Amino acid sequence: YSSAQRVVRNATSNDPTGPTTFDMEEISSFTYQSQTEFMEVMDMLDRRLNDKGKNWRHVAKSLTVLDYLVRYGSDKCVLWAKDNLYIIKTLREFVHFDETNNDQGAIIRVKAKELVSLLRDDERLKQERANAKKN
Ligand SMILES: [Cl-]
Ligand SMILES: [Cl-]
Ligand SMILES: [Cl-]
Ligand SMILES: [Cl-]
Numbered sequence: 001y002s003s004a005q006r007v008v009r010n011a012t013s014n015d016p017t018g019p020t021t022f023d024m025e026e027i028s029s030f031t032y033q034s035q036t037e038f039m040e041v042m043d044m045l046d047r048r049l050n051d052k053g054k055n056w057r058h059v060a061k062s063l064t065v066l067d068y069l070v071r072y073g074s075d076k077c078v079l080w081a082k083d084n085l086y087i088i089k090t091l092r093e094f095v096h097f098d099e100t101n102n103d104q105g106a107i108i109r110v111k112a113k114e115l116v117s118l119l120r121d122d123e124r125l126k127q128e129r130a131n132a133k134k135n
Pocket of ligand 4: 117
């Protein structure tokens with residue numbers, strides 16, 4: 001793994017805490033570097049979004065990072081998310097009952113539904129990204 005990949009993995013691990021704001025700022029900064037590094041970041045989010053069951057936090061945290069990247073990361077992040085809208089839409093139905101039979105999947109479904117809606121709302125996203133760049 002590259003350094004950027006280790007950070008993305010750290011920020012999307014099973015640890016029930018995180019990612020932090022600094023974690024997401026760091027990952028966002030990685031998307032403004034080489035195309036190779038940008039692709040390494042998105043590929044690792046892609047890999048985490050494919051996890052299931054007990055590893056549900058990998059999916060929830062990766063959706064958190066991805067929503068942050070669509071608003072603060074490079075424009076290529078928005079392009080990746082739109083090109084891969086299928087993945088995000090599929091996660092709107094994610095299910096995972098834990099040991100006490102609580103469906104921790106609700107967290108993932110909400111985040112996926114919210115991200116699909118943000119990607120749909122092109123003008124809203126444009127103005128939110130412009131405000132981020134303004135600052
Ligand atoms: Cl982990
Ligand atoms: Cl898994
Ligand atoms: Cl940009
Ligand atoms: Cl809506």
